[PDB]
Design a protein around this ligand. Structure first.
Ligand SMILES: CC(C)CN(C[C@@H](O)[C@H](Cc1ccccc1)NC(=O)O[C@H]1CO[C@H]2OCC[C@H]21)S(=O)(=O)c1ccc2ncsc2c1
Lengths: 99, 99
């Protein structure tokens, strides 16, 4: 589909057996999801933006479906105020900016 | 142009007669630029990012050119880690997400 930017580019995603709303975010290097109890091993990480850093747990090779498009990659989990789909997964679903 | 997302979507902007690099950031409602001198009046505001809230100078109705596309809108200036172009201006240059 084509998504205009009048409103936040929120779409439904499926991860770890749960449906959620997430931002298609071209300004996010990595994918950062709101606190959730994923199984498996993880590594601690810090990611910074406006206002400073948050501590997140890094899970690798996590499957996510974004608008029916499947993707698999690194997912960071932590106290983010919104679910953010970053470039590492946006590339995998064939997402581009166009103007 | 069509911009893939394997690298940061960084582009050259012109604001206040000065060239800068900025990130096309579909996850940002507003445009936030690093500390700089800008002509015109401004009002202090607060914005929150992933790591908390920061104080910024809000400039209204500012001319800014993005990849040769002209926009006129609100520009926030403050201690952001990266110059970001947010949806308020991305809509003006006709930017959309596509996959
Ligand atoms: C700042 C940019 C460069 C990086 N961010 C992405 C950016 O799109 C954030 C997303 C967001 C965060 C919190 C609430 C809403 C939206 N928007 C943002 O701050 O917008 C400001 C300005 O407008 C206002 O509307 C929205 C909020 C206001 S990030 O989240 O900090 C990030 C993500 C992955 C990642 N991987 C390694 S670092 C890293 C850093």
């Amino acid at each position: 589909p084509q998504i205009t930017l009048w409103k936040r580019p929120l779409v439904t995603i499926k991860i770890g057996g749960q449906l959620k709303e997430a931002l298609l975010d071209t300004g996010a290097d990595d994918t950062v999801l709101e606190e959730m109890n994923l199984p498996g091993r993880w590594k601690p990480k810090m990611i910074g933006g406006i206002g400073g850093f948050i501590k997140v747990r890094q899970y690798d090779q996590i499957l996510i479906e974004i608008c029916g498009h499947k993707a698999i990659g690194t997912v960071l989990v932590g106290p983010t105020p919104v679910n953010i789909i970053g470039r590492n997964l946006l590339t995998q679903i064939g997402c581009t900016l166009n103007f």
